[PDB]
Paper text:
Moreover, the binding mode of the N-terminal residues of Rpl10 (L10-N) by the eight-bladed WD-repeat β-propeller of [name], as revealed by X-ray crystallography, allows establishing a refined model for the final pre-60S maturation events that lead to the stable incorporation of Rpl10 and the release of Nmd3. We conclude that the β-propeller domains of [name] and Rrb1, which harbour the essential function of these proteins, recognize the very N-terminal residues of Rpl10 and Rpl3.
Subsequently, we could solve the structure of the [name] [name] WD-repeat β-propeller domain at 2.0 Å resolution by molecular replacement using the native ctSqt1.52C structure as the search model. [name] and ctSqt1 share a high degree of overall structural conservation and mainly differ in three ctSqt1-specific insertions located in the loops connecting β-strands 1c-1d, 5c-5d and 7c-7d. Analysis of the electrostatic properties revealed that both β-propeller structures notably contain a negatively charged top surface, whereas the bottom sides exhibit a charge-mixed surface. Further Y2H assays showed that the predicted WD-repeat β-propeller domains of [name] (53C construct, deletion of amino acids 1–52) and Rrb1 (60C construct, deletion of amino acids 2–59), which support wild-type growth, are sufficient to mediate the interaction both with full-length or the N-terminal residues of Rpl10 and Rpl3, respectively.
Residue numbers in the entry: 53 to 431
The structure:
Amino acid sequence: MSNNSLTYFDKHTDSVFAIGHHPNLPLVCTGGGDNLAHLWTSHSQPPKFAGTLTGYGESVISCSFTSEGGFLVTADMSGKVLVHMGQKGGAQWKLASQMQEVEEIVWLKTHPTIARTFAFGATDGSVWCYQINEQDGSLEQLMSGFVHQQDCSMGEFINTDKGENTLELVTCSLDSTIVAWNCFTGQQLFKITQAEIKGLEAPWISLSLAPETLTKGNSGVVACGSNNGLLAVINCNNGGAILHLSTVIELKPEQDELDASIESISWSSKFSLMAIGLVCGEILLYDTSAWRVRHKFVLEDSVTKLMFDNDDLFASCINGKVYQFNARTGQEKFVCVGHNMGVLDFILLHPVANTGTEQKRKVITAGDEGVSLVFEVPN
């Protein structure tokens, strides 16, 4: 009950803000407040160090590999984006190109299914989508859009279901607007304003695409999430029609307004559930047909990330633990302990091949203390 981790990586000298994993190689990338990115392996004790990435003007806040496994894309708070090219079957990562089109990047993300593609949003509200040349790793801009009038807090690709050439992105802003884009043309498909949500002010924070298996084939249903407790579930394939809208919490007197902030959203197709996690530490599991809460968990402190995986819900917390819940029962099974300060992000890894052996999943964290921890978790 103090540290049940398997191993760790602690080369960062400041907060570990982002963590990404290669789609096929046992390779982690973490980005930190020391303006560095470190590569290390996820299959050994202790991790093997695989290199340090340099060139940033600020803290690194995004690390993600492209879906096909070529290229690492990293972003920092001075607005720089760097592209490293995988060489020697992922054994060496060479800087291929870089850019700096904005003052500060909030969020990046590499498209889950279309090769060599990524998008990012900035504090000035702008939205950018790029592709990466397969041969030399050069940058190819698809679009640049300036519609949001405050910070572009999050983006999420949609219709990821339809092959290359169907490249669509939903972005949201603290100015209450939500926009969908055709990334290839830079065309704004629809834009949600206060007018569409009863005139409510709703500075958006979180976005999450629903699995098609839960929406009867619709590959464009997105749950949103504001910093004052507003949940909107929108149909991006029907002009952003609102499928659900509610305030998810009734705050207590003089309780923090940001306590209602929806920090993370995750869907479960298996259980027809959508979980949201709040700054006040509440975790709410919604039935995705009736949009009513099914289970409610309450953590000691702020939820920082939620992730459904098989029968479980994983939840990282700013108290420095990662909790694992039985998605069906609601029972706490297992808590990852050993961090001093908060867990800012995490990934979950499965054993690649079925060996007729049990083989546990791994949670690997991004710690505010500058430490990543590797946990083996039940079933």
